[PDB]
Write a protein that binds this DNA or RNA. Structure first.
Ligand SMILES: [Mg+2]
Ligand SMILES: [Mg+2]
Ligand SMILES: [Mg+2]
Ligand SMILES: [Mg+2]
Ligand SMILES: [Mg+2]
Ligand SMILES: [Mg+2]
Ligand SMILES: [Mg+2]
Ligand SMILES: [Mg+2]
Ligand SMILES: [Mg+2]
Ligand SMILES: [Mg+2]
Ligand SMILES: [Mg+2]
Ligand SMILES: [Mg+2]
Ligand SMILES: [Mg+2]
Ligand SMILES: [Mg+2]
Ligand SMILES: [Mg+2]
Ligand SMILES: [Mg+2]
Lengths: 117, 32, 67, 96, 87
RNA sequence: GAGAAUGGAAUUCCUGGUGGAGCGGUGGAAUGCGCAGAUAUCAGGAGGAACACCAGUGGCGAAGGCGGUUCUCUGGGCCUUUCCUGACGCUGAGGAGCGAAAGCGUGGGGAGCGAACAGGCUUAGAUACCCUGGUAGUCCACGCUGUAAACGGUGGGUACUAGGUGUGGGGUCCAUUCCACGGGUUCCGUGCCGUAGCUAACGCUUUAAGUACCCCGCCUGGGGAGUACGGCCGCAAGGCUAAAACUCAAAGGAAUU
RNA sequence: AAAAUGUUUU
C-alpha cells in the first residue's frame, strides 16, 4: 500500500514462543508474526525453527508492503533471537545495529515465587 | 543432631496446637 | 589475581569532574567492579557515590544502552 | 555556619539576564542572614544525559555558599517551589 | 557540642586549671550530653540505637558518681547540687 | 540509627496511535485472555513498592539486623605521642529495655508478590507439587505481641601458649619522589592453613573447643512434656513459670564397613 | 514430569 523504506524490527523471544514486529520508526507496527500465527502451537512453538518461520513470514509481508533495510532491536531470554536474525537476512534486507532492548529491573517489583518442579 | 528429635518435638507441638485450635471456644468460655 | 591489577590513584573525586567518572564507568554504562577498576576500597566507594550523584544530576547516563 | 555546594539545572529556555536575576534573588535570600556566598559559576547550556521534564538540555549553575543549615534548607525549598528550575542538588563536602 | 561549650564545661567544672579528665568534669560533660540526647530523642522517639547510647551514658555517669560519693560524700553532694540536684 | 525531601529503571493500570489472530502457560496441556482488536509496538499519564551495576573473599551494629541520592539530627568504634583523673575495674540473680518474620488493634495505602480461595491439569484419589486467577498480608503512622535453626547450636572479662598467608581501619619509617608506587613496623579488626595442646570422634587451635583466674545462665536417661493444674502477661493468637501418674531399657553423639 | 505399598513363622 505505502512504501516505508526504512522501518525497524522488534524480536521478542521468550521461553514460550517468539514474536516479530516490523514497525515504522514512528513506532506504528507495519507487520507482525509469531510461532502461533505460522502454524506451530503449544510447546513446539518455542523452537528456534518456529522463530525462523515467523521471522521470515513477517519479513516477507513487510516486503510486499515495500520495506528496505532494517534496524533491529531484540528482547527476551528466548532461543530464536539469532535464528530470526538469520531469517531476516536470508529473506534479504540489510540488518543494522542489533540492539539489546531487553528490560532489566533495578530490583523494582518482586518476582514471582520460585517454581518447585 | 539427627533431626529425628526435632521431628518428634515438631509433631508433639503441632498436635497440641491443633488441640488448642479445636478447643479454642470452650477454653475461653470456661478456663484458659 | 588482583595484585597484577595495579592499584590506581585518582586524588579528588569531585562528581562534577566527568573525566574520571567516565574512566570508571563501563562501556554499557555500569560501574566497573573493583577487581577490574583497580581501586582501593575507599576510592571505589567515592567513585560509586559520585557516579550515582552524576546519574541523578544528569551529568552521566543511567545506561548508555546502544554502545 | 557550614558550607554547601548547590548544583542547579535551570530550564533551557532561559537566555541570560533572567538567569542572573534568579541567581541574584536567591543569593539575596541566602545573604539576608549572615550567609556569605563564596562563588557562583554558570557552566551554561549543556545537553542532558537524559531527558528531564521533556527537555534535552539545561543551564548548569554551581553555587558555593557558607551559611546555616536552616538557611540552606530555606533556599532549597524556594528552589523546589519555583517552577522555572528543573532540578536542584545540595552537596555538603564534609572536608571542603 | 561544637567543642565551645564543651571547653566551657571542662573549665568551669575542672578541679584545677589543667584538669580535663577528673570525675567531676566527666560527670558534667555526660550530663550535658544526656540532656542534648534527651531532646534529640524527644524529637525522634524512634531512635532506639541512640537511646541505647543514652542509657550507656547514664550508667557511666552513675558509676562515676558512685566513685565520687564513695571517696568524698560532701563533694558528691556539692557536685550533684550544681548538677540538677539528682532528681 | 531516626527524620524529611528526592532520583532513575522495571512491573501494572489508564489514554491515544499503529496493527491483526492469537496470546499466555507447561513435562504435555487446559483453565484464562483476545476480532467488543488482545499479545506486540510507540507516545503521554497515574500509582505503589523495591533500590541493577558499585557489592564480595567486604563494612557497621549488643543482638535482631543494616545498601538509590541528598540534607538535618544522633549512637558507637579505631589510632596517637604528649595531657588529665588515679583502680573509678569485671560480672551481674531479680528487674528493665531492645528484639527477624508472621500475627493483632485503629487509620491510611495497595503496583508487584501472595496464605486462604476459585478454576485447570496430574493422579487410584491430589483438600499437593505445576498452571491461570486471587483476599488478608507484604507498605505507611501509632501501639500490641516478645517468639525463631534469635546458630558460631560455642556467656562476658582477663593473662599466657609455634608459625604461615589473605584482607578491612588508623598511625609512623624508609628510598626514589619531595605525590604516590613500594617495602617495612606498630595498634585494632576480619578470614584460611597449621604446631604444641585438647577432644569419643568429627574437629578446635592466639578470633580456642589449649593453659589458667573471676562472675552469670544452664544440664542430670528416653517418652509423657515445655503438656496439665495454678499464677503472671496479652485485645486475641498465645507467651512465661512449670509438674506428676504412667511407660520404655534404651534414647543419643561422632565415626567405620 | 508425576509413578504408592511390603502382617504373626520357629
Ligand atoms: Mg518512620
Ligand atoms: Mg550482585
Ligand atoms: Mg565472608
Ligand atoms: Mg597525680
Ligand atoms: Mg524480660
Ligand atoms: Mg511485620
Ligand atoms: Mg495491620
Ligand atoms: Mg486496615
Ligand atoms: Mg498459585
Ligand atoms: Mg539469625
Ligand atoms: Mg539455645
Ligand atoms: Mg551474660
Ligand atoms: Mg571465656
Ligand atoms: Mg588478628
Ligand atoms: Mg569441649
Ligand atoms: Mg504452655
Amino acid at each position: 500500500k505505502k512504501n516505508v523504506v526504512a522501518g525497524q524490527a522488534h524480536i521478542k523471544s521468550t521461553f514460550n514462543n517468539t514474536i516479530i514486529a516490523i514497525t515504522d520508526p514512528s513506532g506504528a507496527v507495519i507487520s507482525w508474526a509469531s510461532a502461533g500465527t505460522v502454524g506451530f502451537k503449544g510447546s513446539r512453538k518455542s523452537t528456534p525453527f518456529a522463530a525462523q518461520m515467523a521471522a521470515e513470514a513477517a519479513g516477507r509481508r513487510a516486503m510486499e508492503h515495500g520495506m528496505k533495510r532494517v534496524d533491529v532491536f531484540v528482547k527476551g531470554p528466548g532461543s530464536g533471537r539469532e535464528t530470526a536474525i538469520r531469517s531476516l537476512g536470508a529473506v534479504g534486507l540489510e540488518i543494522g545495529p542489533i540492539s539489546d532492548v531487553t528490560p532489566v529491573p533495578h530490583n523494582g517489583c518482586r518476582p514471582p515465587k520460585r517454581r518447585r518442579v | 543432631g539427627s533431626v529425628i528429635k526435632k521431628r518428634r518435638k515438631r509433631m508433639a507441638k503441632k498436635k497440641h496446637r491443633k488441640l488448642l485450635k479445636r478447643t479454642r471456644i470452650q477454653r475461653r468460655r470456661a478456663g484458659k | 589475581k588482583v595484585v597484577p591489577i595495579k592499584t590506581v590513584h585518582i586524588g579528588a573525586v569531585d562528581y562534577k569532574d566527568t573525566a574520571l567518572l567516565r574512566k570508571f564507568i563501563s562501556e554499557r554504562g555500569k560501574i566497573r567492579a573493583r577487581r577490574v577498576t583497580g581501586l582501593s576500597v575507599q576510592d571505589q566507594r567515592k567513585v560509586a557515590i559520585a557516579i550515582k550523584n552524576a546519574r541523578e544530576l544528569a551529568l552521566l547516563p543511567y545506561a548508555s544502552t546502544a554502545r | 555556619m557550614r558550607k554547601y555546594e548547590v548544583m542547579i539545572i535551570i530550564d533551557p529556555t532561559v537566555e541570560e539576564r533572567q538567569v542572573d536575576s534568579l541567581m541574584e534573588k536567591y543569593l539575596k535570600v541566602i545573604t539576608d542572614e549572615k550567609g556569605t556566598v563564596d562563588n557562583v559559576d554558570v557552566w551554561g547550556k549543556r545537553r542532558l544525559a537524559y531527558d528531564i521534564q521533556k527537555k534535552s538540555e539545561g543551564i548548569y549553575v554551581v553555587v558555593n555558599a557558607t551559611c546555616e543549615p536552616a538557611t540552606i534548607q530555606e533556599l532549597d525549598r524556594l528552589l523546589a517551589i519555583d517552577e522555572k528550575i528543573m532540578r536542584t542538588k545540595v552537596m555538603r563536602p564534609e572536608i571542603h | 557540642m561544637d567543642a565551645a561549650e564543651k571547653k566551657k564545661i571542662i573549665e568551669e567544672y575542672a578541679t584545677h586549671p589543667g584538669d580535663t579528665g577528673s570525675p567531676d568534669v566527666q560527670v558534667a560533660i555526660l550530663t550535658k550530653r544526656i540532656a542534648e540526647l534527651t531532646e534529640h530523642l524527644k524529637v525522634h522517639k524512634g531512635d532506639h540505637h541512640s537511646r541505647r547510647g543514652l542509657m550507656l551514658m547514664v550508667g557511666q555517669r552513675r558509676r562515676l558518681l558512685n566513685y565520687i560519693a564513695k571517696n568524698d560524700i560532701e563533694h558528691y553532694r556539692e557536685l550533684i547540687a550544681r548538677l540538677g540536684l539528682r532528681r
